[PDB]
Amino acid sequence: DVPVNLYRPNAPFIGKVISNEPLVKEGGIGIVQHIKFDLTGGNLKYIEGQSIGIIPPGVDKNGKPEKLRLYAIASTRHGDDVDDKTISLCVRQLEYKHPESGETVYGVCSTYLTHIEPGSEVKITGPVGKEMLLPDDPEANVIMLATGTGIAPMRTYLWRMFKDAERAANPEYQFKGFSWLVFGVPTTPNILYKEELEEIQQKYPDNFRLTYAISREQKNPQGGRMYIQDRVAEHADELWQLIKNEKTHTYICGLRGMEEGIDAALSAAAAKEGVTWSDYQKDLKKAGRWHVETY
Numbered sequence: 001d002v003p004v005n006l007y008r009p010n011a012p013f014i015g016k017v018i019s020n021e022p023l024v025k026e027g028g029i030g031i032v033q034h035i036k037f038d039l040t041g042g043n044l045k046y047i048e049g050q051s052i053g054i055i056p057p058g059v060d061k062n063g064k065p066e067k068l069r070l071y072a073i074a075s076t077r078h079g080d081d082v083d084d085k086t087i088s089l090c091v092r093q094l095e096y097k098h099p100e101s102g103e104t105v106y107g108v109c110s111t112y113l114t115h116i117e118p119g120s121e122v123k124i125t126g127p128v129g130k131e132m133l134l135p136d137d138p139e140a141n142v143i144m145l146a147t148g149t150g151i152a153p154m155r156t157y158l159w160r161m162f163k164d165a166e167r168a169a170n171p172e173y174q175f176k177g178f179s180w181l182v183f184g185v186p187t188t189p190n191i192l193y194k195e196e197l198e199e200i201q202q203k204y205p206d207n208f209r210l211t212y213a214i215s216r217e218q219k220n221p222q223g224g225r226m227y228i229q230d231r232v233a234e235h236a237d238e239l240w241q242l243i244k245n246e247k248t249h250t251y252i253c254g255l256r257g258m259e260e261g262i263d264a265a266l267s268a269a270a271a272k273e274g275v276t277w278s279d280y281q282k283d284l285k286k287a288g289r290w291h292v293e294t295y
Protein backbone atom coordinates (compact mmCIF):
# COMPACT_ATOMS: atom_id res chain seq x y z
CA ASP A 1 0.00 0.00 0.00
CA VAL A 2 2.34 2.74 -1.31
CA PRO A 3 0.48 5.98 -2.18
CA VAL A 4 1.43 7.36 -5.64
CA ASN A 5 0.13 10.51 -7.47
CA LEU A 6 -2.40 11.88 -5.02
CA TYR A 7 -1.84 15.19 -6.94
CA ARG A 8 -1.14 15.20 -10.65
CA PRO A 9 0.73 17.77 -12.82
CA ASN A 10 -2.59 19.06 -14.15
CA ALA A 11 -3.99 19.72 -10.64
CA PRO A 12 -1.08 20.21 -8.23
CA PHE A 13 -1.24 20.68 -4.44
CA ILE A 14 -0.60 24.37 -3.55
CA GLY A 15 1.19 24.79 -0.22
CA LYS A 16 3.03 27.55 1.57
CA VAL A 17 6.74 27.53 2.19
CA ILE A 18 7.38 27.44 5.95
CA SER A 19 11.12 27.98 5.72
CA ASN A 20 14.14 28.11 3.46
CA GLU A 21 17.46 27.46 5.22
CA PRO A 22 21.02 27.50 3.80
CA LEU A 23 22.98 24.26 3.89
CA VAL A 24 26.37 25.40 2.45
CA LYS A 25 28.53 27.05 5.11
CA GLU A 26 30.87 29.96 4.39
CA GLY A 27 33.69 29.12 2.00
CA GLY A 28 31.64 26.49 0.23
CA ILE A 29 30.69 26.29 -3.40
CA GLY A 30 27.33 27.68 -4.53
CA ILE A 31 23.99 27.39 -2.82
CA VAL A 32 22.07 24.39 -1.49
CA GLN A 33 18.84 25.00 0.43
CA HIS A 34 16.64 22.99 2.79
CA ILE A 35 13.08 23.98 2.03
CA LYS A 36 10.09 22.95 4.11
CA PHE A 37 6.47 23.19 2.90
CA ASP A 38 3.12 23.12 4.69
CA LEU A 39 0.73 20.30 3.69
CA THR A 40 -2.01 21.02 6.23
CA GLY A 41 -5.52 20.97 4.74
CA GLY A 42 -4.55 18.76 1.84
CA ASN A 43 -3.98 15.05 1.81
CA LEU A 44 -0.46 14.61 0.45
CA LYS A 45 1.01 11.54 2.18
CA TYR A 46 4.42 10.11 1.35
CA ILE A 47 7.09 7.69 2.52
CA GLU A 48 10.91 7.64 2.55
CA GLY A 49 12.71 7.34 -0.77
CA GLN A 50 9.87 8.94 -2.78
CA SER A 51 10.05 12.19 -4.83
CA ILE A 52 7.83 15.21 -5.60
CA GLY A 53 7.48 17.46 -8.65
CA ILE A 54 7.66 21.25 -8.31
CA ILE A 55 6.10 23.34 -11.04
CA PRO A 56 7.73 26.71 -11.32
CA PRO A 57 5.84 29.81 -12.52
CA GLY A 58 6.29 31.13 -16.06
CA VAL A 59 6.63 29.80 -19.58
CA ASP A 60 9.62 28.46 -21.49
CA LYS A 61 11.24 30.02 -24.62
CA ASN A 62 8.47 28.31 -26.76
CA GLY A 63 5.46 29.84 -24.99
CA LYS A 64 4.55 26.63 -23.19
CA PRO A 65 4.00 26.45 -19.38
CA GLU A 66 7.04 25.21 -17.43
CA LYS A 67 7.11 21.49 -16.71
CA LEU A 68 7.66 19.94 -13.26
CA ARG A 69 11.16 19.24 -12.02
CA LEU A 70 11.51 16.25 -9.68
CA TYR A 71 13.15 16.49 -6.24
CA ALA A 72 13.91 13.68 -3.81
CA ILE A 73 11.98 14.07 -0.63
CA ALA A 74 14.36 15.00 2.20
CA SER A 75 12.03 14.42 5.21
CA THR A 76 10.53 11.22 6.66
CA ARG A 77 6.77 10.54 6.24
CA HIS A 78 6.09 12.64 9.33
CA GLY A 79 8.00 15.64 8.07
CA ASP A 80 10.73 17.42 10.00
CA ASP A 81 8.30 18.58 12.74
CA VAL A 82 7.21 14.94 13.26
CA ASP A 83 3.50 15.83 13.06
CA ASP A 84 2.59 14.70 9.51
CA LYS A 85 2.02 18.35 8.39
CA THR A 86 5.13 19.11 6.32
CA ILE A 87 7.59 18.02 3.67
CA SER A 88 11.17 19.11 2.98
CA LEU A 89 13.41 19.26 -0.11
CA CYS A 90 17.15 19.63 -0.54
CA VAL A 91 17.79 21.92 -3.53
CA ARG A 92 21.02 23.03 -5.27
CA GLN A 93 20.91 26.17 -7.30
CA LEU A 94 21.91 25.23 -10.82
CA GLU A 95 24.54 27.59 -12.12
CA TYR A 96 26.80 27.24 -15.15
CA LYS A 97 28.72 29.05 -17.91
CA HIS A 98 27.05 29.00 -21.32
CA PRO A 99 29.21 26.85 -23.67
CA GLU A 100 29.40 29.44 -26.45
CA SER A 101 28.64 32.91 -24.99
CA GLY A 102 30.51 32.58 -21.65
CA GLU A 103 27.65 34.12 -19.64
CA THR A 104 26.58 32.84 -16.24
CA VAL A 105 23.28 30.93 -16.57
CA TYR A 106 20.86 29.84 -13.82
CA GLY A 107 18.27 27.03 -13.82
CA VAL A 108 14.64 28.14 -13.69
CA CYS A 109 13.13 25.91 -10.99
CA SER A 110 16.24 25.68 -8.73
CA THR A 111 16.61 29.49 -8.69
CA TYR A 112 12.89 29.86 -8.01
CA LEU A 113 13.13 27.30 -5.17
CA THR A 114 16.46 28.44 -3.65
CA HIS A 115 15.33 32.11 -3.36
CA ILE A 116 11.71 31.40 -2.29
CA GLU A 117 10.43 33.34 0.76
CA PRO A 118 8.45 31.82 3.66
CA GLY A 119 4.71 32.34 2.97
CA SER A 120 5.04 31.78 -0.83
CA GLU A 121 2.55 29.34 -2.43
CA VAL A 122 4.20 26.56 -4.45
CA LYS A 123 2.84 23.92 -6.93
CA ILE A 124 3.59 20.39 -5.78
CA THR A 125 2.86 17.02 -7.45
CA GLY A 126 3.28 13.39 -6.43
CA PRO A 127 4.57 11.67 -4.49
CA VAL A 128 6.16 9.52 -7.22
CA GLY A 129 8.42 6.46 -7.14
CA LYS A 130 8.73 2.92 -5.82
CA GLU A 131 12.41 2.33 -6.71
CA MET A 132 14.03 3.74 -3.50
CA LEU A 133 11.88 2.47 -0.63
CA LEU A 134 13.31 1.46 2.72
CA PRO A 135 12.51 -2.06 3.97
CA ASP A 136 10.22 -2.47 7.01
CA ASP A 137 12.68 -4.99 8.48
CA PRO A 138 14.58 -3.33 11.39
CA GLU A 139 17.31 -5.95 10.98
CA ALA A 140 18.12 -5.00 7.38
CA ASN A 141 21.52 -3.56 6.56
CA VAL A 142 21.57 -0.32 4.61
CA ILE A 143 24.39 0.81 2.32
CA MET A 144 23.92 4.36 1.00
CA LEU A 145 26.11 5.85 -1.73
CA ALA A 146 25.40 9.54 -2.40
CA THR A 147 26.83 12.50 -4.29
CA GLY A 148 25.66 16.07 -3.65
CA THR A 149 21.89 16.47 -3.23
CA GLY A 150 21.87 12.67 -3.54
CA ILE A 151 21.92 12.74 0.26
CA ALA A 152 18.19 13.64 0.20
CA PRO A 153 16.66 10.14 0.32
CA MET A 154 19.46 9.00 2.67
CA ARG A 155 18.34 11.69 5.07
CA THR A 156 14.85 10.22 5.06
CA TYR A 157 16.24 6.75 5.88
CA LEU A 158 18.72 7.95 8.54
CA TRP A 159 16.29 10.16 10.37
CA ARG A 160 13.71 7.39 10.44
CA MET A 161 16.37 5.02 11.76
CA PHE A 162 18.05 7.23 14.35
CA LYS A 163 16.24 10.43 15.34
CA ASP A 164 14.84 10.46 18.89
CA ALA A 165 11.42 11.82 17.90
CA GLU A 166 11.23 9.37 14.98
CA ARG A 167 12.07 6.36 17.22
CA ALA A 168 9.37 7.58 19.66
CA ALA A 169 6.81 7.92 16.83
CA ASN A 170 7.56 4.56 15.15
CA PRO A 171 7.23 1.77 17.72
CA GLU A 172 7.02 -0.85 14.97
CA TYR A 173 10.43 0.26 13.53
CA GLN A 174 13.36 0.25 15.92
CA PHE A 175 16.42 -0.15 13.70
CA LYS A 176 18.99 -2.73 14.86
CA GLY A 177 20.86 -3.41 11.56
CA PHE A 178 24.06 -1.92 10.24
CA SER A 179 24.01 1.32 8.30
CA TRP A 180 26.81 2.72 6.09
CA LEU A 181 26.73 6.11 4.31
CA VAL A 182 29.43 7.09 1.81
CA PHE A 183 28.91 10.78 0.92
CA GLY A 184 30.72 12.75 -1.84
CA VAL A 185 30.72 16.57 -1.89
CA PRO A 186 33.50 19.02 -2.94
CA THR A 187 34.42 20.83 0.33
CA THR A 188 33.85 20.60 4.06
CA PRO A 189 31.44 23.58 4.10
CA ASN A 190 29.56 21.66 1.36
CA ILE A 191 28.88 18.68 3.60
CA LEU A 192 25.07 18.81 3.66
CA TYR A 193 23.67 18.07 7.11
CA LYS A 194 27.24 17.53 8.54
CA GLU A 195 26.44 18.16 12.20
CA GLU A 196 23.35 15.96 12.27
CA LEU A 197 25.10 13.11 10.42
CA GLU A 198 27.99 13.31 12.87
CA GLU A 199 25.52 13.40 15.79
CA ILE A 200 24.01 10.13 14.54
CA GLN A 201 27.40 8.33 14.30
CA GLN A 202 28.28 9.43 17.84
CA LYS A 203 25.07 8.09 19.34
CA TYR A 204 25.01 4.87 17.26
CA PRO A 205 28.62 3.88 16.60
CA ASP A 206 27.59 0.23 16.19
CA ASN A 207 24.67 0.87 13.83
CA PHE A 208 25.95 3.71 11.66
CA ARG A 209 29.16 4.37 9.74
CA LEU A 210 29.91 7.64 7.96
CA THR A 211 32.51 7.91 5.19
CA TYR A 212 33.28 11.15 3.26
CA ALA A 213 34.69 11.62 -0.25
CA ILE A 214 35.60 15.31 -0.08
CA SER A 215 36.63 15.79 -3.68
CA ARG A 216 38.68 18.98 -3.46
CA GLU A 217 40.35 18.47 -0.06
CA GLN A 218 41.31 14.76 -0.53
CA LYS A 219 43.08 12.85 -3.26
CA ASN A 220 42.72 9.23 -4.29
CA PRO A 221 45.89 7.06 -4.29
CA GLN A 222 46.30 7.76 -8.05
CA GLY A 223 46.60 11.59 -7.81
CA GLY A 224 42.91 12.42 -8.61
CA ARG A 225 40.04 14.01 -6.67
CA MET A 226 38.58 11.71 -3.99
CA TYR A 227 35.24 10.49 -5.44
CA ILE A 228 32.63 7.95 -4.16
CA GLN A 229 34.03 5.11 -6.30
CA ASP A 230 37.46 5.70 -4.79
CA ARG A 231 36.06 5.23 -1.31
CA VAL A 232 34.16 2.21 -2.58
CA ALA A 233 37.31 0.63 -4.12
CA GLU A 234 39.19 1.36 -0.86
CA HIS A 235 36.64 -0.76 1.11
CA ALA A 236 35.58 -3.02 -1.73
CA ASP A 237 36.05 -6.34 0.08
CA GLU A 238 34.17 -5.36 3.20
CA LEU A 239 31.30 -3.91 1.14
CA TRP A 240 31.09 -7.04 -0.98
CA GLN A 241 31.04 -9.10 2.22
CA LEU A 242 28.08 -6.98 3.34
CA ILE A 243 26.26 -7.03 0.00
CA LYS A 244 26.32 -10.89 0.08
CA ASN A 245 24.09 -10.76 3.22
CA GLU A 246 20.51 -11.37 2.11
CA LYS A 247 19.34 -8.73 4.57
CA THR A 248 21.43 -5.95 2.95
CA HIS A 249 19.94 -3.20 0.76
CA THR A 250 22.07 -0.86 -1.31
CA TYR A 251 20.91 2.66 -2.29
CA ILE A 252 22.63 4.78 -4.96
CA CYS A 253 21.63 8.41 -5.46
CA GLY A 254 23.42 11.20 -7.36
CA LEU A 255 25.63 11.22 -10.49
CA ARG A 256 25.32 8.39 -13.07
CA GLY A 257 29.11 8.66 -13.43
CA MET A 258 29.53 7.03 -10.01
CA GLU A 259 28.06 3.71 -11.21
CA GLU A 260 30.75 2.54 -13.63
CA GLY A 261 33.44 2.84 -10.90
CA ILE A 262 31.30 1.17 -8.23
CA ASP A 263 30.72 -1.81 -10.54
CA ALA A 264 34.47 -2.05 -11.21
CA ALA A 265 35.50 -2.14 -7.55
CA LEU A 266 32.85 -4.74 -6.78
CA SER A 267 33.46 -6.75 -9.93
CA ALA A 268 37.09 -7.08 -8.79
CA ALA A 269 36.27 -8.07 -5.16
CA ALA A 270 33.59 -10.53 -6.34
CA ALA A 271 35.98 -12.18 -8.84
CA LYS A 272 38.56 -12.91 -6.08
CA GLU A 273 35.91 -15.35 -4.81
CA GLY A 274 34.82 -16.79 -8.19
CA VAL A 275 31.66 -14.71 -8.51
CA THR A 276 30.81 -12.64 -11.58
CA TRP A 277 29.44 -9.32 -10.19
CA SER A 278 27.34 -8.34 -13.18
CA ASP A 279 25.22 -11.52 -12.90
CA TYR A 280 24.90 -11.32 -9.13
CA GLN A 281 23.90 -7.65 -9.51
CA LYS A 282 21.21 -8.72 -11.97
CA ASP A 283 19.71 -10.94 -9.22
CA LEU A 284 19.89 -8.23 -6.55
CA LYS A 285 17.95 -5.97 -8.95
CA LYS A 286 15.24 -8.61 -9.47
CA ALA A 287 15.05 -9.37 -5.71
CA GLY A 288 14.64 -5.59 -5.21
CA ARG A 289 17.76 -5.02 -3.06
CA TRP A 290 19.75 -2.84 -5.45
CA HIS A 291 18.25 0.66 -5.56
CA VAL A 292 19.35 3.26 -8.06
CA GLU A 293 18.27 6.88 -8.60
CA THR A 294 20.58 8.92 -10.79
CA TYR A 295 19.88 12.20 -12.56
Ligand SMILES: Cc1cc2nc3c(=O)[nH]c(=O)nc-3n(C[C@H](O)[C@H](O)[C@H](O)COP(=O)(O)OP(=O)(O)OC[C@H]3O[C@@H](n4cnc5c(N)ncnc54)[C@H](O)[C@@H]3O)c2cc1C
Nearest residue numbers: 069070071072090091092094096107108109110149152295
Ligand atom coordinates in the same frame (compact mmCIF):
# COMPACT_ATOMS: atom_id res chain seq x y z
C1 LIG B 1 14.62 11.72 -9.88
C2 LIG B 1 15.23 13.01 -9.78
C3 LIG B 1 15.50 13.49 -8.50
C4 LIG B 1 16.12 14.74 -8.33
N1 LIG B 1 16.41 15.18 -7.03
C5 LIG B 1 17.00 16.43 -6.89
C6 LIG B 1 17.29 16.92 -5.63
O1 LIG B 1 17.03 16.29 -4.63
N2 LIG B 1 17.86 18.16 -5.46
C7 LIG B 1 18.18 18.91 -6.60
O2 LIG B 1 18.71 20.01 -6.48
N3 LIG B 1 17.89 18.43 -7.86
C8 LIG B 1 17.29 17.21 -8.02
N4 LIG B 1 17.00 16.77 -9.26
C9 LIG B 1 17.31 17.63 -10.44
C10 LIG B 1 16.13 18.62 -10.62
O3 LIG B 1 14.98 17.90 -11.04
C11 LIG B 1 16.34 19.72 -11.67
O4 LIG B 1 16.72 19.09 -12.88
C12 LIG B 1 17.42 20.72 -11.25
O5 LIG B 1 17.01 21.39 -10.05
C13 LIG B 1 17.62 21.75 -12.36
O6 LIG B 1 16.36 22.29 -12.76
P1 LIG B 1 16.25 23.79 -13.18
O7 LIG B 1 14.85 24.01 -13.51
O8 LIG B 1 16.92 24.67 -12.14
O9 LIG B 1 17.12 23.91 -14.50
P2 LIG B 1 16.55 24.11 -15.99
O10 LIG B 1 16.12 25.51 -16.15
O11 LIG B 1 15.63 23.00 -16.29
O12 LIG B 1 17.85 23.87 -16.92
C14 LIG B 1 18.40 22.55 -17.10
C15 LIG B 1 18.95 22.51 -18.53
O13 LIG B 1 20.10 23.36 -18.50
C16 LIG B 1 21.02 22.89 -19.49
N5 LIG B 1 22.38 22.82 -18.93
C17 LIG B 1 22.87 22.39 -17.76
N6 LIG B 1 24.20 22.57 -17.79
C18 LIG B 1 24.52 23.10 -18.97
C19 LIG B 1 25.69 23.47 -19.50
N7 LIG B 1 26.77 23.28 -18.73
N8 LIG B 1 25.76 24.01 -20.75
C20 LIG B 1 24.58 24.18 -21.52
N9 LIG B 1 23.38 23.77 -20.94
C21 LIG B 1 23.38 23.26 -19.68
C22 LIG B 1 20.56 21.53 -19.94
O14 LIG B 1 19.91 21.78 -21.20
C23 LIG B 1 19.51 21.14 -18.90
O15 LIG B 1 18.45 20.39 -19.54
C24 LIG B 1 16.42 15.54 -9.43
C25 LIG B 1 16.13 15.07 -10.72
C26 LIG B 1 15.52 13.82 -10.90
C27 LIG B 1 15.25 13.39 -12.25
Ligand SMILES: NC(=O)c1ccc[n+]([C@@H]2O[C@H](COP(=O)([O-])OP(=O)(O)OC[C@H]3O[C@@H](n4cnc5c(N)ncnc54)[C@H](OP(=O)(O)O)[C@@H]3O)[C@@H](O)[C@H]2O)c1
Nearest residue numbers: 092094147148149150184185186215227254255257258295
Ligand atom coordinates in the same frame (compact mmCIF):
# COMPACT_ATOMS: atom_id res chain seq x y z
N1 LIG C 1 25.88 15.05 -7.47
C1 LIG C 1 24.64 15.11 -7.90
O1 LIG C 1 23.63 14.68 -7.11
C2 LIG C 1 24.39 15.73 -9.28
C3 LIG C 1 23.37 15.23 -10.11
C4 LIG C 1 23.12 15.81 -11.37
C5 LIG C 1 23.90 16.90 -11.77
N2 LIG C 1 24.92 17.41 -10.92
C6 LIG C 1 25.74 18.58 -11.34
O2 LIG C 1 26.50 19.07 -10.22
C7 LIG C 1 25.94 20.34 -9.79
C8 LIG C 1 25.90 20.37 -8.27
O3 LIG C 1 25.40 19.12 -7.81
P1 LIG C 1 24.93 18.91 -6.32
O4 LIG C 1 25.27 19.89 -5.25
O5 LIG C 1 24.22 17.61 -6.06
O6 LIG C 1 26.41 18.17 -6.10
P2 LIG C 1 27.81 18.93 -5.57
O7 LIG C 1 28.14 19.15 -4.16
O8 LIG C 1 28.82 19.16 -6.65
O9 LIG C 1 28.47 17.42 -5.32
C9 LIG C 1 28.90 16.55 -6.38
C10 LIG C 1 30.15 15.73 -6.01
O10 LIG C 1 30.38 14.77 -7.12
C11 LIG C 1 31.77 14.83 -7.41
N3 LIG C 1 31.96 14.27 -8.78
C12 LIG C 1 32.12 14.95 -9.93
N4 LIG C 1 32.25 14.09 -10.96
C13 LIG C 1 32.18 12.86 -10.46
C14 LIG C 1 32.27 11.59 -11.02
N5 LIG C 1 32.44 11.42 -12.33
N6 LIG C 1 32.15 10.51 -10.21
C15 LIG C 1 31.96 10.65 -8.91
N7 LIG C 1 31.90 11.85 -8.34
C16 LIG C 1 31.99 12.97 -9.09
C17 LIG C 1 32.00 16.33 -7.32
O11 LIG C 1 33.39 16.56 -7.28
P3 LIG C 1 34.14 17.77 -8.06
O12 LIG C 1 33.06 18.86 -8.58
O13 LIG C 1 35.10 18.34 -7.12
O14 LIG C 1 34.66 17.13 -9.43
C18 LIG C 1 31.38 16.63 -5.98
O15 LIG C 1 32.26 16.29 -4.88
C19 LIG C 1 24.51 20.31 -10.32
O16 LIG C 1 23.96 21.63 -10.41
C20 LIG C 1 24.76 19.70 -11.69
O17 LIG C 1 25.41 20.59 -12.60
C21 LIG C 1 25.14 16.83 -9.67
